[PDB]
């Protein structure tokens, strides 16, 4: 299965992603902005660059429950976050 996620300046959409577990799933990353953005969930050890106006697929299988944090490291003080559940 496939779960679509925009980058844009400065958000994720979703913001809040549920994925399941011991199951592949694909990420289709999409960065709709002008700007450079990352796809990082370090607990799950993701960690993708994404040029403006391009897209990368990443395929995940996740083997605990629980709640990770997404970020762009491109950010400081105001950050750009999301939510990947594993499910």
Avoid: Q, W
Wanted: hydrophobic fraction near 35%; charged fraction near 30%.
């Amino acid at each position: 299965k496939v779960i679509e996620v925009e980058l844009n300046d400065d958000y994720f959409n979703p913001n809040v992603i549920t994925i399941p577990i011991n199951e592949s799933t694909t990420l289709l990353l999409k960065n709709k902005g002008k700007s450079e953005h990352t796809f990082t969930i370090k607990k799950l050890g993701i960690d993708v660059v994404v040029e403006s106006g391009k897209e990368k697929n990443i395929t995940v299988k996740p083997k605990s429950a629980g709640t990770y944090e997404l970020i762009c490291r491109y950010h400081l003080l105001k950050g750009m976050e999301g939510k990947v559940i594993v499910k």
